[PDB]
């Protein structure tokens, strides 16, 4: 997976996976985006007791990582509304999100 | 490769993969979306004696197949602007472009 679409996500372990690149939704509940074996960025969620943490697209643009309750812990903050939106780990090392849909076959 | 970003594109030969769908950019100068063995879409560009075209999305959100000495075949006619975009082969074996960016990082 390189890609999420509308309300997809990651779940605690899950990742993106472009080479060397790896997205990880992680069991300590931050989101890192490893380069080789560098973390490069992270969501800065990373927090003791907090579990079952999950990173999703919503189909409103903003992508949220939410607490086991359903706590949003951090966000990106791109709220556009209605569209089709989505993120992309790319081989430049940048997670980005588009939207919305201009074109399909 | 699964997507396309801005002036980033598929020359004569190559082919955005994702089982069991592949869009190419043909010799014969035809870009097709292929379901398996099927053609269920093309640009309808293999024209008599062109060769060496290609297939690029510009900055601008369009998407275009050249011929070798650069003249416009065929458009998307999706030109939204100057911004970021990206050309993404789906799962579902549709060809779509999203942008501009809405975040990054
Ligand atoms: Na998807």
């Given at each position: 997976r390189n890609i999420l679409d509308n309300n997809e996500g990651l779940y605690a372990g899950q990742s993106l996976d472009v080479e060397p690149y790896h997205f990880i939704m992680?069991?300590?509940?931050n989101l890192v985006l490893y380069d080789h074996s560098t973390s490069t960025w992270?969501?800065?969620t990373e927090?003791?007791?907090?579990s079952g943490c999950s990173a999703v697209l919503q189909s409103d643009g903003?992508?949220?990582?939410?607490?086991?309750?359903?706590?949003?812990?951090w966000a990106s903050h791109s709220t556009r509304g209605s569209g089709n939106?989505?993120?992309?780990?790319?081989?430049?090392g940048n997670v980005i999100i588009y939207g919305s849909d201009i074109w399909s076959t």
């Amino acid at each position: 997976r390189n890609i999420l679409d509308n309300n997809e996500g990651l779940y605690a372990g899950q990742s993106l996976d472009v080479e060397p690149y790896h997205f990880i939704m992680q069991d300590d509940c931050n989101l890192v985006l490893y380069d080789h074996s560098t973390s490069t960025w992270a969501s800065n969620t990373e927090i003791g007791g907090k579990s079952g943490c999950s990173a999703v697209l919503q189909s409103d643009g903003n992508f949220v990582v939410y607490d086991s309750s359903g706590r949003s812990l951090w966000a990106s903050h791109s709220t556009r509304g209605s569209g089709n939106y989505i993120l992309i780990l790319q081989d430049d090392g940048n997670v980005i999100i588009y939207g919305s849909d201009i074109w399909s076959t």
